[PDB]
Structure formats: C-alpha cells, structure tokens
C-alpha cells in the first residue's frame, strides 16, 4: 500500500525557487552542505505549508531570511520531508537556507552524493538531489545554480560542477575550493559535482554556425587515462551530427565527461558535466572487447543529444520521461547508423526491442511509454520508455520524411527552448509539419497520441490477392492489440508500413518503395500494373513496433532472404522461417515428453533454407555482420513471445536439434569461412589508433566468433587447435571467445586461468572476463559461480562486478531454469543481499523473473515462491517492493 503518484494529478507548485547557492565541503568522515534558496510565492499558492524533500539529511540548522527556524514550533522533519508551517512562510520573496551533514563515504546506493573508489561524485536523476540538500525535488522547479566545492587538495585536486568556473582559491589546512556558475535554468536532477585526482584529455571544438570555441574534457582516474581517446572522438562526432542534421550547437564554453567505476546506470546528462559508468566511456583496443566501441559511441552520443532533448527542453513532470529518453535514443540511433554505416546497427536495436521490450509489454509490468502512475520513478527507466519510445519517435520521421521531420523538430525546439515540455508538445510540433506535408490544415495527429497512452504490442497481419489478367495486386491488412490490465479495450493505431514488391523471377523491385498508412482496424491496399505475382517486402526498416504476421510460405521467405533490398525484411524472413521450425519441433518434443512416448518423429529443417544460408555465407560480397544473424536462432526472449507455458527444457532440446540439423550440413562451410575470414578480420591496421574504428572489420570478427562457437559445440574435428590459436590473438573479442567456446573441451580451465591473467589488471576487462565465465556453457556452472564468488567477486559492492557475475548466467536456458529451482533461489538470494545496500541494482537483478507467468506450471510456481519470499524480507526497499508487487499483480 505505497505512496502512488498519478499523471492526471499534476499541478504546479505554490512556490518558486529562482536561485540555488551551494557550498559543498567534503571531509573524510562527513560532507557539510550549505544551501541558500532564493524563493518566491507562485500564483498557484493557497497559503500551504512549505514542504521540502530531504532524505537522510542531518540538520545542523535551517533558516528563513537569516533567522533560524525552531524545530517543533516552526518546522518538523521526519527524514523524508521538511515541513515549515505556513504561519512562518513569507508571503513574498524570501531566502531559505540550511546546513546539513551527509556521508558520501558510506553511500553504497550510489544515489545522491557518494564515493566511487577515490572519487566523490553525485547522481541526482530522478529524485536524488533531495539526498544532498533540501529541495522541491521535481523537474518543473527550474533555477540557476551557484556552486562552491571545497576539499583536501592532495586527495581532490580536480573539482567540478555545472557551468563556468568563476573562481579557484586556497583554504587553510591543505584545502582548496572552486566555484561554478551555470547560467541555464535547470531542474535539480541535472545538478552534478565531482571531486577527485582526475587526469584528462582535451580538445577545442569550434561550433559550425556561431564559431563558438568549446573546450572538451574527458576525465578518468590516472590508471586509465590512456583509455579516454575514443570517447573524445565520439563526442566530437556527436557535436557535428547535431549541427549537421538538426542545426543544433552547444551552448556553454566547456563540456566535461567523467568516468567513474561505481555507477548504477550507463551515464547521466548533467549540464556541462556528463558522468559515465566507466564501461560506457573507457576503452583501448588492447584491453576492451570490440563491443565497447559501439557502446561508447552510443552513450557519449546519447548524453550529448540530451543537451537539447532533456536539458534545454526539459520535462514538466516525470510521466513525460519518454519525451527526453525516447527522443534522445532516436537521435542516438540516427547518429550511430550514420557513423557505423552497417546494416547491423538497426538490426541490433530491432533484436533488442522484439526480445526484451516485447517481453515487457506482454508481462504484468506492461505500461504505455507515458505511464499513468508510479511509486519509485527509478523503476520506469524501462526498455518500453526508452526503446519503444524511440520507435514511436522514429515513426514520425518515417511518416513525414526527412524534410518535414526536420521542420517539425525545429518547431519543437523553437517553441519549447528553455522551458519544461510534455509529450503533447512534441506531437503538436510534428502535427504542424504533418499539415504542411499533407497540404491540409485539417490533418491532425490526434490518433498518433495513442502511441503514448496505449500499452501492448500491436499485431499486424496480412492476406494477399493477385489477379494475373488484371495485373492487380491486393494487400489486406489487419491490426489488433490484445487487451491487458491497462486498457480492456484497445484502439487502432496510426501504423506506417514501409513496403516494397519483389519480382520472384529476377529479384527486382516492382514499385517505388512506399509507406502505407494503416489507421483503421483493417484496410485493403490495391496496386495496379503489377506485371507478375510479387512477394511483398513488409515493414521495411522495421517501420512500426509491432508483431508482423507475413503469412508467407518458407519458399517466399527464402526468396526475400536472398534477393530483397531491405536488411530488416531479409532478417525477419529468416527469423520467421526459424520460428516456424522452432514451434513445430517444440511441439513434437513437448508431446513426446507429456505422453511419455517411447518413439516419435521430428520434422527436419527445410533443406532449401539450409541451401540459402550456405549461398549467403559463401557470397564474398555479402555482409559479414548480416551473416552472423542468419546462422543464429532467434533469441530465447523473442521465442517465448510465441509459446504458452514454455518448458525451457523442451525449448533447449528444440534449439539443440535445429542447430545440429544445420551444422550437420554446413559445418564444413563454417570452418572454411572461419579460416578464410582470418586475414581481414584480424588485420592489425589501426590497432594503435584510438581515433579510428572499422565497424565492418569488427563485424567480420563477430562472424568468426559466431562460427567458432557453432563449430566448438559441434565438436568439429580438431577445432580445439583453432581455439588454442585463437586464444593467442591480440584482440580481446577473440581471446575471450576462446574461453567461451572452450567450455566444450578439457582445456576450459587452462584458458580460464590464461584469460584471467590477461584480464585481472584492468578493471573493465576483468568485468568482461567475469561475463564470459558467467555465460559459459558449462555443466559445472553452479560450481564455477561459487569459484567466482570466493576468488574474484568476494564482497564487492561495485554494480558492474555483481551484474557481470550473475546476469549472463541467468540467460543459461538449460541451467538457470533447472527444474529444481536452484537458479531462481540463487538469484533471489543475490537480489535480497544487494537490496540492503543498492536497491536500484537489486531490482535490475530481478530481470529474469519478468517472464515468470509465461513459463510452464512448475517453473511459474517456483519463481513465484522466490518472489514472494523476497517480498517478505524485512526492510525491503521501496524499489524492490514496488517492482515485485507489480510483477506478481499485487500493484
Ligand atoms: N538520463 C540517464 C538515465 C540513465 C539511463 C538508463 Br536507466 C538507461 C539507459 C540510458 Br542510455 C541511461 C542514460 C540517461 O541519459 O538516459
Ligand atoms: Cl568564491
Ligand atoms: Zn537518456
């Protein structure tokens, strides 16, 4: 029965905070925070008490207009809210001031002000500023910030906060201070401070239009300063992209990026002072796997793009979160697609959406991208809000085209720059462009708003007709969203369907690609002068976030896979072929299990599909990244969206059969390709250059490592020789793959020790090594996890360490879901232990339970018993309690 906030209840504050003047004085065993708030009474004031958020603060004194308030008589504080009785609240402009004590050195929850190794750092989104000092801690309370930080100079030579550094000064006793002025009004969740012995790389950027000089700095601890350069390159690329595509320039004289080792999320867009999980900022080619480079490009870009979509235009309230996150992910997706120029970039986003986000949207946690209520906002930084939000933001571009999309985006910025905004404000701007494109001032996007308010994944299904004498082709389309616990009645959405038509005789396009606008529950689209029966290429680029039911034969899907122009449709046609096979074999194994059959049949894999995989693999002009997708079955969390009461044992048996069906025909091709790809995949050009990344070459290594895994599982003759040579590669992607694939051989623990020694002296590489062990397909994985706990992880409270040890293992379909329930018990024990010092990470660790009600009856009960046991833990966090109550349909 928690405190629940509702979107419909929004109302402006009765107060105004115009300026914030902070003095943050860091000592070994306490930090003293002095704060002066220059305040006023708003037009919405009705004489209410003045209530500040303030969580876990120790009050030394509080004052109004430099007269101390008296506890009990004039205020009360209950460790969450400071209430000043209205009788003592002025009726015009006044100053509120306070001095509180906080303890970053024991703040293991990494919210508010905390210590990460030898760095002091803040994290204030969403509602952490109230853990530093008193505030009306909501994003519509925008103010200007004057921040002084003081500390021991030897321990903390670098002091940072938002904006211009206006003074530096020495203090008796070996201390010093620095003062910052941020001229841009901001909500308090964008405040940040950093103190540490930081080293940096720097550059000067000159903006495109106003020719402003901007100093760019990237910071880390001294040991890792050599890992800063790619992030700086990524920042320069991000700034140029926002200038080139959106015409947006940076608006301060300096921008700082800072890496810290202990961080709950990827990074944070604090104004002029972006703070990063080190794993999302630091890399070097000797000490990072390839995937670090796309991760840093993404996160550095994302944080930079927030400078407009989030900071200069911010949020009226937290229900609008997708307005900054969906939009900023979309901006980062456009950026990364342009930077990498690989079709796999878009494909990876689709692969993530249709696995983890579709799972979420059919789970008890399902919510629209603009939720209707919350208890802890930190539980709603979800793949729905971010990734479905991004697809909803991308649909605007698909509908409008680039020219009118840019026009609408510029309207959004112009109308809302410097202010809070709502999702409706964005839709309104897009609507102005829509009216232009349609040349119709009665056109509107009112229906489009359902994408913000309606939960659940739409299902879009197709039927076809071709009249050869008339040369007339028809596509009959239906949409359906399943009722859920948010709406028992669902409405049709505005679904853009990018389509082409392929001539199956020559593989050629038969129409100009066109985007069909489905706005009704069903529609028929007719095409004339279609000279022969086509195969339709549907939802090109994955043009709407939906379940696609193409009702094509496997023969037609093979032709698309081979000849279509659109990477997504080729990949999806392959996905659909696999799913048809998976569901068939799954049912065959399931019946044999349920009926305790002594003999039964399995349906073999389609031989023409196997031939098509071989054809694409052997094509020297086809794309290595795309090839790695075609030889992999769909993700387990994708598959589960199509199976009721999923028995994970039967699914594992199903995958095993299909992979071996294909390998028994293609392993020699796999081996030949693994060998022929080596020269180009592993070429050492630019290995000593952190300013250039070859994303195509990286995709060649991904393909090689995918093929090696398939060949190792298959026990291909003498493949251990290749694994051992692979362990000698300079590329960590390769030598960590050699550990993974050696799980099937007696050399596993030899390579475990070899790669440990290669990893143990770099904090981030060791975490990648932990992930590799955790995900190893070992029969003794439970004993290996104990080894990691006892020898490596031990008592670490570092979120990266804990997540590395446990989350990859939870994707071990056969072992995590052991029918004894021991894997559920193991992870629940970790969740409960972690919740006592880091509620956010504890809730992140709950991820495997999200599919609990989609599993077979026995596993459902096992998972539910562990969740209810977690709910019984004394002093459970609000974060974890809310999450588990919602997930078990109690909230
Ligand atoms: N505002 C920050 C919130 C933290 C977070 C989370 Br949670 C998930 C993905 C990303 Br990317 C981020 C970075 C961010 O800038 O959105
Ligand atoms: Cl000063
Ligand atoms: Zn973000």
């Amino acid at each position: 029965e928690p405190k629940i906030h509702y979107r419909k209840d929004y109302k402006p504050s009765g107060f105004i905070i115009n300026n914030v003047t902070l003095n943050i004085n860091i000592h070994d065993n306490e930090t003293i925070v002095r704060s002066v708030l220059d305040m006023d009474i708003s037009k919405h004031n009705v004489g209410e008490d003045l209530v500040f958020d303030g969580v876990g603060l120790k009050i030394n004194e509080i004052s109004i207009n430099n007269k101390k308030l008296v506890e009990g008589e004039e205020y009360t504080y209950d460790n969450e809210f400071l209430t000043i009785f209205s009788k003592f609240v002025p009726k015009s402009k006044f100053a509120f001031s306070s001095e509180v004590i906080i303890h970053p050195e024991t703040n293991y929850a990494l919210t508010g002000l905390y210590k990460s190794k030898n760095i002091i750092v803040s994290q204030c989104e969403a509602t952490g500023f109230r853990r530093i000092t008193f505030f009306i801690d909501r994003p519509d309370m925008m103010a200007k910030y004057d921040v002084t930080v003081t500390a021991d100079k030897e321990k903390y030579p670098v002091l940072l906060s938002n904006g211009d550094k206006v003074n530096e000064f020495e203090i008796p006793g070996g201390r010093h201070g620095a003062r910052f002025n941020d001229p841009h009004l901001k909500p308090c969740y964008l405040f940040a401070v950093v103190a540490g012995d930081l080293k940096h790389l720097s550059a000067t950027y000159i903006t495109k239009y106003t020719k402003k000089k901007v100093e760019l700095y990237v910071f880390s601890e001294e040991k890792y300063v050599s890992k800063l350069q790619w992030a700086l390159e990524c920042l320069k690329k991000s700034m140029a992209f926002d200038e080139d595509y959106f015409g947006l320039e940076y608006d301060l004289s300096r921008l700082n990026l800072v890496a810290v080792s202990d961080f709950n999320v990827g990074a944070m867009e604090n104004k002029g002072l972006n703070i990063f999980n080190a794993n999302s900022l630091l890399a070097s080619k000797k000490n990072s796997i390839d995937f670090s480079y796309a991760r840093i490009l993404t996160v550095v870009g994302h944080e930079y793009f927030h400078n407009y979509t989030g900071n200069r235009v911010t949020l009226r309230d937290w229900f609008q979160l997708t307005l900054k996150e969906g939009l900023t992910v979309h901006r980062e997706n456009l950026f990364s697609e342009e930077m990498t120029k690989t079709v796999t970039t878009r494909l990876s986003h689709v692969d993530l959406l249709r696995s983890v986000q579709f799972l979420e949207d059919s789970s008890p946690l399902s919510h629209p991208i603009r939720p209707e209520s919350y208890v802890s906002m930190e539980n709603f930084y979800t793949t729905t809000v971010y990734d479905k939000g991004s697809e909803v933001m991308r649909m605007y571009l698909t509908i409008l085209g680039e020219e009118y999309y840019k026009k609408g985006f510029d309207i959004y910025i112009k109308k809302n720059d410097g202010n809070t905004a709502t999702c409706e404000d964005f839709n309104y701007a897009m609507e102005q462009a829509y009216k232009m494109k349609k040349a119709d001032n009665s056109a509107n996007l009112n229906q489009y708003l359902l994408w913000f308010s309606q939960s659940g994944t739409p299902h879009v299904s197709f039927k076809y007709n071709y009249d050869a004498e008339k040369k007339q082709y028809s596509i009959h389309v239906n949409q359906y969203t399943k009722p859920d616990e948010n709406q028992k009645e669902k409405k049709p959405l505005f679904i853009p369907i990018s389509v082409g038509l392929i001539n199956p005789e020559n593989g050629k396009e038969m129409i100009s690609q066109t985007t069909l606008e489905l706005t009704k529950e069903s529609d028929t689209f007719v095409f004339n002068n279609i000279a022969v029966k086509p195969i339709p290429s549907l939802f090109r680029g994955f043009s709407a976030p939906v379940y696609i039911e193409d009702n094509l034969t496997d023969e037609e899907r093979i032709l698309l896979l081979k000849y279509d122009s659109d990477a997504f449709v080729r990949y999806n046609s392959c996905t659909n072929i696999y799913m048809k096979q998976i569901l068939m074999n799954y049912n065959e194994f399931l019946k044999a299990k349920n009926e305790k059959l002594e003999s039964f049949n399995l349906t073999p894999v389609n031989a023409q599909f196997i031939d098509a995989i071989k054809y694409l693999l052997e094509d020297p002009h086809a794309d290595a990244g795309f090839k790695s997708y075609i030889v992999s079955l769909p993700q387990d969390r994708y598959i589960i969206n199509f199976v009721s009461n999923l028995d994970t044992d039967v699914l594992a048996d199903t995958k095993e059969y299909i992979y071996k069906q294909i390998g028994d025909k293609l392993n020699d091709v796999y081996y030949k390709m693994f060998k022929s790809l080596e020269a180009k995949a592993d070429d050492l050009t630019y290995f000593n250059d952190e300013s250039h990344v070859d994303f195509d070459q990286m995709n060649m290594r991904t393909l090689r490592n995918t093929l090696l895994s398939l060949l190792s599982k298959a026990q291909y003759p003498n493949i251990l020789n290749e694994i051992i040579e692979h362990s000698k590669s300079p590329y960590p992607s390769n030598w960590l793959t050699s550990l993974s694939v050696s799980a099937y051989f007696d050399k596993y623990f030899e390579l475990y020790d070899k790669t440990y020694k290669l990893s143990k002296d770099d904090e981030l590489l060791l975490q990648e090594w932990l992930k590799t062990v955790s995900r190893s397909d070992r029969k003794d994985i439970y004993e290996i996890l104990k080894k990691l706990e006892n020898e490596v992880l031990k008592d670490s409270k570092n979120p990266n360490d804990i997540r590395a040890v446990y989350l990859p293992f939870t994707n071990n379909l056969r072992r995590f879901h052991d029918i004894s329930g021991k894997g559920y018990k193991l992870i629940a024990e970790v969740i409960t232990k972690t919740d006592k010092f880091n509620p956010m990470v504890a809730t992140q660790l709950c991820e495997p339970f999200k599919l609990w009600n989609k599993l077979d009856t026995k596993r459902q009960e096992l998972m539910l018993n562990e969740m209810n046991t977690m709910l019984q833990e004394p002093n459970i966090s609000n974060n974890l309690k809310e999450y588990l109550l919602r997930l078990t349909n109690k909230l």
Side-chain angles (χ1 to χ4, degrees), residues 148 166-169 178-179:
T148 298
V166 293
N167 197 33
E168 292 175 311
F169 57 93
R179 189 169 192 160

Side-chain angles (χ1 to χ4, degrees), residues 634-641 646 651 655 811-813:
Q635 285 272 319
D636 292 343
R637 287 177 285 193
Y638 181 82
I639 295 169
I640 189 163
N641 293 309
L646 177 94
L651 180 55
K655 293 162 59 179
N811 291 296
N812 188 321
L813 184 63

Side-chain angles (χ1 to χ4, degrees), residues 125 265-269 302-303 306 324-325 381 386:
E125 193 182 9
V265 296
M268 179 62 215
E269 67 266 22
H302 185 108
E303 301 308 323
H306 268 310
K324 79 181 174 75
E325 301 301 349
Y381 288 70
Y386 275 69

Side-chain angles (χ1 to χ4, degrees), residues 19-34:
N19 296 85
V20 180
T21 304
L22 301 180
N23 288 81
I24 302 174
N25 305 131
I26 299 164
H27 296 265
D28 286 359
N29 293 295
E30 61 180 14
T31 290
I32 316 301
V33 180
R34 295 180 56 84

Side-chain angles (χ1 to χ4, degrees), residues 774 805-813 816-817 823 827 845 847-848:
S774 181
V805 169
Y806 294 108
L807 289 182
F809 155 77
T810 65
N811 291 296
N812 188 321
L813 184 63
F816 175 68
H817 296 283
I827 193 66
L845 291 170
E847 187 86 5

Side-chain angles (χ1 to χ4, degrees), residues 715-747:
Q715 298 287 281
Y716 191 78
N718 295 306
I719 199 64
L720 186 56
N721 296 326
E722 273 80 18
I723 297 173
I724 294 297
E725 181 63 16
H726 210 57
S727 75
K728 301 171 183 176
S729 174
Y731 287 95
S733 287
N734 291 339
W735 52 260
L736 282 176
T737 293
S738 78
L739 175 55
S740 306
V741 303
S742 71
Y744 306 112
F745 294 90
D746 296 349
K747 287 251 176 64

Side-chain angles (χ1 to χ4, degrees), residues 830-839 842-843 875-877 880:
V830 177
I831 294 159
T832 292
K833 180 199 183 187
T834 305
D835 191 54
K836 298 178 187 305
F837 62 87
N838 192 326
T843 308
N875 288 1
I876 184 175
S877 69
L880 184 60

Side-chain angles (χ1 to χ4, degrees), residues 426-633:
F426 195 81
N427 193 241
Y428 172 90
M430 293 295 119
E431 182 171 280
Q432 308 315 302
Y434 189 64
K435 290 181 192 284
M436 299 178 200
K437 179 177 186 292
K438 297 290 185 175
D440 176 4
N441 280 353
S442 71
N444 69 76
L445 294 179
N446 295 348
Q447 181 181 16
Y448 200 86
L449 278 176
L450 293 173
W451 282 114
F452 289 86
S453 58
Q454 187 166 281
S455 60
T457 312
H459 299 252
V460 181
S461 59
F462 296 89
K463 288 183 178 189
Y464 316 102
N465 187 252
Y466 183 65
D467 187 318
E469 195 189 330
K470 284 172 181 174
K471 292 188 161 190
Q472 187 176 78
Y473 185 65
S474 306
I475 300 175
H476 180 65
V477 190
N478 280 85
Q479 63 168 300
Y480 167 86
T481 301
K482 184 188 175 183
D484 61 17
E485 292 291 304
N486 298 312
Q487 289 100 29
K488 67 191 202 76
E489 294 168 9
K490 301 283 181 179
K491 298 176 202 288
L493 300 171
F494 188 149
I495 300 180
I497 314 177
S498 187
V499 303
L501 297 179
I502 297 302
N503 179 333
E505 279 285 279
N506 59 14
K508 296 283 182 289
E509 312 277 348
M510 304 179 69
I511 57 171
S512 303
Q513 181 168 332
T514 189
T515 291
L516 312 177
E517 294 178 1
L518 178 66
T519 57
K520 303 186 295 190
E521 193 275 315
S522 72
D523 210 341
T524 297
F525 298 84
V526 188
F527 303 82
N528 279 326
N529 298 308
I530 302 302
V532 305
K533 189 176 173 185
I535 304 175
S537 178
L538 300 172
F539 283 103
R540 285 186 167 178
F542 190 61
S543 65
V546 306
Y547 287 112
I548 300 166
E549 180 47 70
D550 69 16
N551 286 309
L552 298 177
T553 67
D554 281 355
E555 166 185 274
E556 289 171 313
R557 290 168 173 160
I558 287 162
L559 290 169
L560 292 173
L561 175 53
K562 294 183 72 179
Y563 301 119
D564 196 1
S565 58
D566 188 67
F568 167 74
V569 173
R570 301 174 72 200
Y571 155 85
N572 197 41
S573 300
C574 185
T575 298
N576 295 340
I577 296 171
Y578 274 132
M579 283 306 305
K580 178 187 172 72
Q581 185 71 33
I582 290 166
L583 293 184
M584 172 66 53
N585 289 149
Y586 175 91
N587 194 64
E588 286 164 343
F589 277 117
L590 181 65
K591 292 185 294 174
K593 183 175 185 166
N594 285 340
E595 297 167 34
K596 303 190 168 194
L597 300 183
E598 298 301 334
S599 62
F600 64 104
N601 286 79
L602 290 162
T603 298
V605 176
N606 180 312
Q608 288 72 52
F609 176 52
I610 293 174
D611 287 338
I613 297 177
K614 178 173 191 287
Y615 178 85
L616 293 180
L617 273 173
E618 289 175 343
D619 185 348
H621 303 115
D623 176 83
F626 183 80
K627 295 179 185 188
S628 68
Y629 279 93
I630 301 314
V631 293
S632 305
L633 264 65

